Write a protein that binds this ligand. Structure first.
Ligand SMILES: Nc1ncnc2c1ncn2[C@@H]1O[C@H](COP(=O)(O)OP(=O)(O)O)[C@@H](O)[C@H]1O
Lengths: 735, 306, 306
């Protein structure tokens, strides 16, 4: 009908004069003026999601979003089974992007330019769309000492594979290899004409003519002249080959590329792939945490809504508020790096993979902490049920009053379990936000970020507990003592850093000026036979597979000489060949141990990083702060002046350590030993000796009080004399 | 095919447990059964092969009973920690947890249409819930004591309940009170359509009542007349259910024995060496020739039917 | 007597699988069907009664394909755990297991003579094994990548196969390559001898090939000339088979529809809304008026022919 012609008219309008716009105001302008001109020239014509596809029929038909989402989800499951198996969530605009790359791959010479923020999936989405369209994907690989001759060899081989072999090929690449001066000319010619002269000279010309002979014979056309066969080769390249370039949204880069490659902006099709809008953030947060039990029936709405995502439900639900906060904690990083740019600091790229790791850490921490808390409450229940049995049934009264304090502590911990279920979600939210977003900030800005997040959550009436330290929640005493025994400085910042280096979703960088963090991370994983190398080391190529196959962790320094060959490792583009896991490196394919992690470290703390590493690696800063410096400032001066007092302080602190550990072990042994017997406690007499032998070993708490008194009374010799010196000297260091 | 009766030996004897059993059921579609326990655990074994698949954790106290939706995706469980947990059997993780019960929950039952769930607890109240949201839509009361078990009819309109008050109460979402029992009523079971013709010549709707008085009594739902009474159990009855064809009744009691009752002839037909310790509960597969019994003996034996 | 065609509603709708379905096939002799699933399992059902018969578990990874000897005793299966398992369909036990494929094996096929078995796998090679010993006797090569499926002709002298290279290859125990598909080729079907007359009206041997283009094509094997192209599927093709008499072609595609085509007129006639999701495989009973379709949706449907 007429209306269908209007639909295709408007679809072409919105896919030619809206795909390359930058700001949302321009898009609103285009859509509204399309509506007005449609009203003017032709008095459900304009259903909001104008959409067209050929995957619900044999030809180009309108489609609806829901069944398209179902189809692409099933086909993406098949894609997982076939190629990569990287869990990808489906939000709204990804469908639009998928249909757009499909449309351009349908067109001959369907070259694409995708202006998108690094980490936004502009490569893997293109691979996914290319896969179902019968389009094999060829990606360039960059190694050390990469020259133009290697790239020319790749171009010769693939042009043979596309011209004479007659198989459809796509070229999804980014700036990585494009940097060199000789690279740009070949693409400026290829995207323009489809043939690149002065490239096939030598015996290569003769052998590709020989191959084109059999190619033309198989196609069915007889050719026996070099020039006409070369024309057929060119026409085949026009038929089969596709090139997709992905660029970061840099104004200077765009101007330079428009200057040095007009055909790249003339022949290719433009798509401002861009960054994820707040709608996309809301959709990802909603759908990735839809399976989690974040529902609170007793949620009360505040009067004032902090609105960072529009079109919210007027009454919001608890999960809706949580995902709203998940959007807020991502816009807060934008605000923070804006402040850091305005003050004159160094800013890192803000990529959606940060948000993805934030949500993954949210789910992981939520699951783990809920499980542990329920397990300990189960222990509490069985212990109370075994003490009440003892009560129902002298040495028995002595044994019942001996466990009186433990019984009181357990009973007091029991009744607050509802409040512990209440504030699990907010605590885990703040924890995950600190894990993901606070990687590359100093102490003061980290505190500022946490304070703003706390203010936002308080404004939203989201329940969380403030009387708990950031390092205390994410780590228990045992691992903290292990870290302190692994040459980690005893301060909150390095505690957080150790939490990053153990509990992470992505492989990290270490920003260490002194190299003490290298010693700490070498001592931590020494049991797994840690080994160290560097990017500039010539044996690193040999060492990579030796680390990967046997699973021994690898430590790599000097990341300012970064080799992109680790790109599959960072993204974990693994495949399962049944009982084995296979990974690719461009040169060779090798197995992976189930347990493997690579450690990356940076020496110079002021190195600006390209967004390719920013989007695929997290950050930790081993900086120095006021109290942190004061610690070794007091230790050094005390050692220099009074060796005896320093030795006494070290011994007292150590003896506090293992004795606190002993107290914890006694509590655990009194809990578990009580539970793991079903024979009425009174009836058992072997039991009474052990369950009153361990309560009697809990009198070392008074010894612990004794050296506690000693340390807090003998510290006045130091802390009341060297405090001003330490304060002035730390101020001196920062000045 | 309406006449396969259990016979020994047990097809499989699964003792991979560290505490007694409370309930056992077959998954409606997939060939798997599940078992509840007092150790705050729900265990998933394949009865067709007898291999261990996984364990479901998350409850903190004794899991009192478990129920399945008609679809076979939504799994419900209740325990003594006041909570009713909804489990995605596909994803194997607690979709949501329920709060509001004042004291211990004995049983829950997903309604056949799979949109609501109803629960029975020690506060002498019956609560019906919205599965998708977790909001308590309504609460039925009138019972005097612990509501030991509640079961809905095949159409969801009528829900029956038993308690320590010895009165089986039924109401339409008190229609009838059945107070003549000599002792606590332990378990109930709606009669299937297959037994309608058999019951008619033996003498709706029609309902059972298993009790701690060592008797099993069949009932008329509308008028509440005790249609008959099976006799012969030596201890407290814990589970009563009909055969798939409605011709037999499979029952268990604490007499360490599983009995098969021909209610047409009003007599016990067959008795099995159920378990060394008391028989907790039973269940009869709708179609396949398998039946299962899990006992307070830390074992979940599967009888084959001939 | 060559014109019974499937029509709705289905004779049976069996939902026992815990996972999607990869193949469905009828036994040559007994009135039973057999299907392989993603859960590393095979299921044997009775299509006449629609009742579950058994499960030949033993595989570790997803069983993708299954094939029978004519005698009905030896059953072949292949799965992604690198292996090919030969089973006694009388004793229901793995007679033997063969290894050697470097990656996932997609398809196997017992030759009609029952002396050897051919297998195709992700490593772009085809291997021919002894049925009674399990020794790799032959290894055809030359595919660039995954051999999606392999089939021998009626006498077994000639073997055809389809891969991701869009090049349906045929060779004697390379004779021909068919390389004018627009996309990956999923399934093939050696045309029956009974079509030799009808195709002569429509226009050897003669070979089918369905592909991700939504295009089924019939081809001359000896000359390699593309003979015709049925189009009309709204998604990827996954299965194609001729009618018993060669008068119609039944095909399955991911359009949630099973199509019945008259290739003489070169047009669709009948369309069956098979399942709510992807249809992965089909089969035609050689004599009985029934067919089978297995879908991603975990449901196997037996379709009544009239
Ligand atoms: N929407 C998304 N959902 C999940 N993962 C994503 C998404 N976008 C990107 N990724 C991650 O990024 C990796 C590939 O990103 P890529 O397409 O190379 O983006 P870029 O080209 O900007 O680096 C994958 O390993 C994937 O895990």
């Amino acid at each position: 009908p007429v209306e269908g012609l209007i639909r295709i008219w408007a679809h072409e309008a919105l896919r030619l004069f809206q795909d390359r716009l930058v700001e949302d105001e321009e898009r609103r302008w285009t859509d509204e003026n399309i509506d007005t001109v449609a009203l003017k020239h032709f008095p459900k014509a304009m259903s909001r999601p104008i959409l067209y596809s050929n995957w619900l029929s044999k030809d180009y038909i309108p489609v609806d979003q829901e069944e398209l989402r179902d189809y692409v989800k099933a086909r993406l499951k098949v894609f997982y089974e076939e190629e990569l198996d990287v869990p990808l969530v489906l939000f709204n605009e990804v469908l639009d992007h998928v249909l757009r790359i499909d449309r351009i791959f349908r067109q001959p010479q369907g070259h694409l330019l995708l202006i998108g923020v690094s980490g936004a999936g502009k490569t893997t989405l293109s691979r996914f769309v290319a896969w179902m369209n019968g389009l094999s994907v060829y990606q360039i690989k960059v190694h050390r000492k990469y020259t133009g001759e290697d790239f020319d060899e790749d171009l010769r081989t693939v042009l043979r594979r596309s011209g004479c072999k007659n198989e459809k090929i796509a070229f999804i690449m980014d700036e990585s290899n494009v940097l060199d001066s000789g690279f740009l000319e070949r693409m400026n010619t290829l995207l323009a004409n489809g043939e690149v002269p002065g490239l096939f000279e030598g015996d290569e010309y003769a052998t590709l003519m020989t191959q084109c002979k059999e190619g033309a014979q198989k196609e069915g056309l007889m050719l026996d002249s070099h020039e006409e066969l070369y024309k057929w080769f060119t026409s085949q390249v026009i038929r089969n080959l596709h090139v997709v370039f992905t660029m970061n949204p840099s104004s200077e880069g765009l101007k330079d590329r428009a200057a040095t490659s007009p055909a790249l902006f003339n022949r290719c099709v433009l798509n401002w792939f861009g960054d994820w809008s707040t709608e996309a953030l809301y959709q990802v947060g909603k759908e990735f945490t839809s399976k989690m039990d974040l529902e609170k029936p007793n949620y009360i709405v505040p009067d004032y809504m902090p609105v960072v995502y529009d079109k919210l439900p007027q009454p919001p639900s608890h999960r809706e508020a949580i995902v709203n906060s998940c959007v807020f904690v991502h816009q807060t990083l934008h605000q923070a790096n804006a402040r850091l740019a305005k003050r004159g600091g160094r800013t890192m790229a803000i990529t959606p993979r940060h948000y993805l790791d934030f949500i993954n850490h949210y789910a992981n921490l939520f699951h783990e902490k809920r499980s542990e808390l329920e397990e300990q409450q189960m222990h509490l229940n069985v212990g109370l049920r075994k003490i009440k049995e003892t009560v129902d049934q002298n040495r028995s009264t002595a044994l019942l009053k001996s466990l009186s304090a433990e019984r009181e502590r357990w009973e007091k911990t029991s009744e607050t379990f509802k409040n512990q279920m209440s504030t699990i979600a907010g605590d885990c939210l703040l924890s995950a936000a600190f894990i993901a977003y606070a990687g590359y900030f100093d102490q003061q800005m980290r505190q500022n970020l946490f304070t703003t997040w706390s203010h936002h959550l308080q404004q939203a009436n989201i329940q969380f507990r403030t009387d708990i330290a950031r390092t205390e929640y994410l780590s228990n005493a045992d691992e903290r003592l292990r870290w302190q025994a692994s040459s980690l400085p005893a301060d909150d910042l390095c505690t957080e850093n150790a939490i990053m280096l153990k509990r992470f979703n992505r492989y990290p960088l270490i920003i260490d000026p002194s190299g003490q963090a290298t010693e700490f991370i070498m001592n931590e994983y020494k049991d797994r036979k840690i080994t160290r190398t560097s990017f500039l080391d010539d044996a690193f190529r040999k060492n990579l597979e030796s680390a990967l196959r046997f699973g021994n962790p690898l430590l790599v320094q000097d990341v300012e000489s970064y080799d992109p060959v680790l790109n599959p490792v960072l993204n974990r583009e693994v495949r399962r060949t049944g009982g084995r896991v296979l990974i690719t490196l461009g040169d060779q394919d090798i197995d992976l141990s189930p347990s493997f992690v690579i450690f990356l470290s940076t020496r110079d703390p002021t190195v600006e990083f390209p967004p390719d590493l920013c989007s695929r690696v997290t950050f930790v800063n081993f900086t120095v702060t006021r109290s942190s410096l004061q610690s070794q400032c007091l230790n050094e001066v005390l050692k220099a002046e009074r060796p005896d007092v320093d030795e006494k302080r070290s011994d007292l602190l150590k003896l506090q350590g293992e004795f606190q550990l002993r107290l914890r072990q006694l509590e655990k042994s009194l809990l578990q030993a009580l539970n793991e017997v079903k024979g009425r406690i009174l009836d058992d007499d072997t039991i009474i000796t052990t369950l009153e032998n361990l309560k009697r070993e809990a009198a070392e708490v008074t010894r612990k009080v004794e050296e506690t008194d000693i340390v807090m009374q003998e510290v006045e010799t130091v802390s009341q004399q060297y405090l001003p010196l330490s304060t002035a000297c730390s101020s001196i260091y920062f000045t | 095919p309406k006449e396969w009766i259990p016979r020994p030996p047990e097809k499989y004897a699964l003792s991979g447990h560290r505490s007694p059993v409370t309930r056992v059921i077959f998954h409606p579609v997939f060939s798997v059964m599940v078992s509840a326990s007092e150790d705050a655990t729900i265990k998933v074994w394949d009865y067709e092969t007898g291999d261990f698949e996984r364990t479901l954790k998350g409850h903190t106290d004794s899991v009192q009973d478990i129920s399945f939706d008609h679809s076979g995706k939504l799994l419900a469980s209740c325990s003594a920690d006041m909570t009713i947990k909804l489990w995605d059997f596909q994803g194997f993780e607690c979709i949501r947890t329920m709060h509001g019960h004042d004291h211990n929950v004995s049983s829950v039952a997903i309604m056949p249409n799979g949109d609501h769930i109803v629960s029975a607890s020690r506060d002498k109240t019956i609560k019906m819930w919205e599965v998708q949201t977790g909001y308590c839509v309504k609460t039925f009361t009138g019972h005097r004591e612990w509501v030991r078990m509640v079961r809905p009819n095949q159409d969801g309109t009528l829900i029956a309940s038993c308690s320590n008050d010895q009165t089986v109460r039924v109401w339409v979402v008190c229609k009838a009170e059945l107070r003549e029992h000599e002792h606590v009523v332990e378990c109930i079971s709606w009669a299937p359509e297959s037994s309608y013709s058999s019951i008619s010549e033996a003498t709706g709707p029609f309902l059972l009542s298993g009790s701690r008085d060592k008797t099993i009594k069949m009932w008329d739902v509308s008028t509440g007349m005790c249609l008959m009474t099976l006799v012969g159990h030596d201890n407290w009855v814990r589970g009563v259910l009909f055969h798939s064809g409605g011709k037999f009744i499979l029952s268990c009691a604490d007499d360490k024995t599983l009995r098969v009752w021909d209610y047409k002839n009003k007599r016990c037909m067959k008795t099995l060496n159920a378990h060394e310790h008391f028989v907790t509960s039973l269940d009869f597969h709708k179609t396949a020739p398998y039946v299962v019994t899990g006992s307070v003996d830390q074992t979940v034996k599967v009888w084959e039917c001939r």
